[PDB]
Write a protein that binds this DNA or RNA. Structure first.
Length: 450
RNA sequence: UAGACU
């Protein structure tokens, strides 16, 4: 047994057996990260097991470090810097980090793999679960999957440590002069989920000129701003869903529009990726966002203010295909190509081994993602055409309609050899051109400068 | 979009 604070002294030996996948479905706030994880790790070390701990985001990574402080753990994430004598037997990294490692060889032969937030719909995370479950099935490892919302979750309002008041109200997606007093009149601390940084900035600036102390959180502001949510006093946290999971704010209210943009592979005509939306989030995401509050048993009157219903069907989301794209090029030390984790199979109808790439194309694929910063789909389309990483011709030889326009003007690229060409890529992926910043990156790619 | 890494 254990008290609420400390981790349990007793750990089930069942979970360490090779060929065993433990699924830990426990409601948000049940101490899964802060209690259960240290228990496993402690028992991992005494058992002397080569151990992998996986966190979806730097936010979760950081909440893990607090709970594991003082244990001989190797942190391979910019979120945590700590002293390490390279003889550790426990590694901790992010889901996407592990996957890209798998694609780039040779990875420690882990006896034990702990995947926290094992519902994460990120194509790399899905791909990781395929590898992990395949390692378990070969009797090469034991694994634990931890998540409050395991695949098949439908309940947007799970149980909490404290009563939650669920309120449906219209929520502004931009600035507002009037009409939304309840936002600013509320005396406590608010966590507000936003689908984008630009939207986040608009709302943040809006709240500031109302006298409110606002910290903005996103992939770009994490390092300097996250510690501020912990040790400092503030009124609002405006956040992208970098904070969707694991985050521990001392908050009283979540504001959740439950909307976001979604990459979708279109197969009506020539195949391409658009950014569909804004569309409702899945029940799992909503439950995670609501799960940020009602965590404190001492504090009984927390609130979750939301707009609209979730949408479970995300089968048109590109991540199911992209995961298969990644997984089809991941191999086990024995030579087996992994199969998707059970509950996530047949999310799209892809042939067995349809995305396998041979020799040099695989190299290029990986390089297009890691060096090129290109989405999985685009990276795959280019690589599988037999184009090498540095050959940017495909950025200019697309059909007439693939002409990229910015500010209603045809985008011109000045190449590394002084040539002027129109940005007209053979494959369209709205992720490299929709946001102005993303387009600049892609302009640099087309230039020959990435 | 969002995340992850160098």
């Amino acid at each position: 047994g254990s008290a609420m604070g400390e981790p349990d002294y007793e750990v089930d030996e069942d979970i360490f057996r090779k060929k065993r996948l433990t699924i830990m479905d426990l409601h948000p706030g049940a101490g899964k990260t802060k209690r259960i994880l240290p228990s496993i790790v402690r028992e991992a070390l005494k058992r002397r097991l080569r151990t992998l701990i996986l966190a979806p985001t730097r936010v979760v990574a950081a909440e893990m470090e607090e709970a594991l402080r003082g244990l001989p753990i190797r942190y391979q994430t910019p979120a945590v810097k700590s002293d390490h004598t390279g003889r550790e037997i426990v590694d901790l990294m992010c889901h996407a980090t592990f996957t890209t490692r798998l694609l780039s060889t040779r990875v420690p032969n882990y006896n034990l793999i702990v995947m926290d937030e094992a519902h994460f719909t990120d194509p790399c995370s899905v791909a990781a679960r395929g590898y992990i479950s395949t390692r378990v099935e070969m009797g090469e490892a034991a694994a634990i999957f931890m998540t409050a919302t395991p695949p098949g979750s439908i309940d947007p309002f799970p149980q909490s440590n404290s009563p939650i008041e669920d309120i449906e109200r219209e929520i502004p997606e931009r600035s507002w002069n009037t009409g939304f007093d309840w936002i600013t009149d509320y005396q406590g601390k608010t966590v507000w989920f936003v689908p984008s940084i630009k939207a986040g900035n608009d709302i943040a600036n809006c709240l500031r000129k109302s006298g409110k102390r606002v910290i903005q959180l996103s992939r770009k502001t994490f390092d300097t701003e996250y510690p501020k949510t912990k040790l400092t006093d503030w009124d609002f946290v405006v956040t992208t869903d970098i904070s969707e999971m694991g985050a521990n704010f001392r908050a009283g209210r979540v504001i959740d529009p439950r909307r976001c943009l979604k990459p979708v592979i279109l197969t009506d005509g020539p195949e391409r990726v658009i950014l569909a939306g804004p569309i409702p989030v899945t029940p799992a995401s909503a439950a995670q966002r609501r799960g940020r509050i009602g965590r404190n048993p001492a504090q009984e009157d927390d609130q979750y203010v939301f707009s609209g219903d979730p949408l479970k069907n995300d089968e048109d989301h590109a991540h199911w295909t992209e995961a298969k794209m990644l997984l089809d090029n991941i191999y086990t030390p024995e030579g087996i190509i992994p199969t998707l984790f059970g509950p996530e199979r047949e999310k799209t109808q892809a042939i067995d081994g349809e995305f396998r790439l041979r020799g040099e194309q695989r190299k290029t694929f990986v390089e297009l993602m890691r060096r090129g910063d290109l989405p999985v789909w685009l990276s795959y389309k280019v690589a599988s055409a037999g184009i090498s990483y540095k050959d940017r011709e495909w950025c200019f030889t697309g059909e007439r309609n693939n002409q990229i326009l910015e500010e209603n003007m045809e985008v011109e690229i000045w190449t590394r050899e002084g040539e002027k060409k129109k940005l007209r890529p053979k494959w369209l992926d709205a992720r490299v051109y929709a946001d102005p910043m993303a387009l600049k990156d892609f302009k640099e790619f087309a230039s020959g400068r990435k």
